[PDB]
Write a protein that binds this ligand. Structure first.
Ligand SMILES: *[C@@H]1O[C@H](CO)[C@@H](O)[C@H](O)[C@H]1NC(C)=O
Lengths: 68, 49
């Protein structure tokens, strides 16, 4: 899977903030080293309190989870 | 008019008074305030900058 979908999710001051970047890769079982900053961002002025995370996945796959 | 801690979204459009160059005028913008000289520059701005 050459496609890497790197996202960042954050809630500050009552808005949901997102980041994204699509970049080709070579390894799928581990994240390769390298630098590529995530310029895109969209602000969602919702005000929703969020403390729990559930991955929404389509069922008729692997992913990583980090913490800031 | 409901305002939240998040950045506001329902804004009010103005008249973006015509712009001039090479003379000291107020350069007040959507987020900037002050006076100065506005010339033409060829910086490589990013789409989100
Ligand atoms: C919910 O978010 C607001 C600001 O968005 C904050 O003031 C409040 O403490 C939060 N409450 C909880 C339970 O996270």
């Amino acid at each position: 899977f050459k496609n890497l979908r790197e996202f960042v999710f954050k809630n500050i001051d009552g808005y949901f903030k997102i980041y994204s970047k699509h970049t080709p890769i070579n390894l799928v079982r581990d994240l390769p080293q390298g630098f590529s900053a995530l310029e895109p961002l969209v602000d969602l002025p919702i005000g929703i309190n969020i403390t729990r995370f559930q991955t929404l996945l389509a069922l008729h796959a692997a992913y990583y989870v980090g913490y800031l | 008019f409901e305002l939240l801690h998040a950045p506001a979204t329902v804004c009010g459009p103005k008249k973006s008074t015509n712009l001039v160059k090479n003379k000291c005028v107020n350069f007040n913008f959507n987020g900037l305030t002050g006076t100065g000289v506005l010339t033409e520059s060829n910086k490589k701005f990013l789409p989100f900058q």
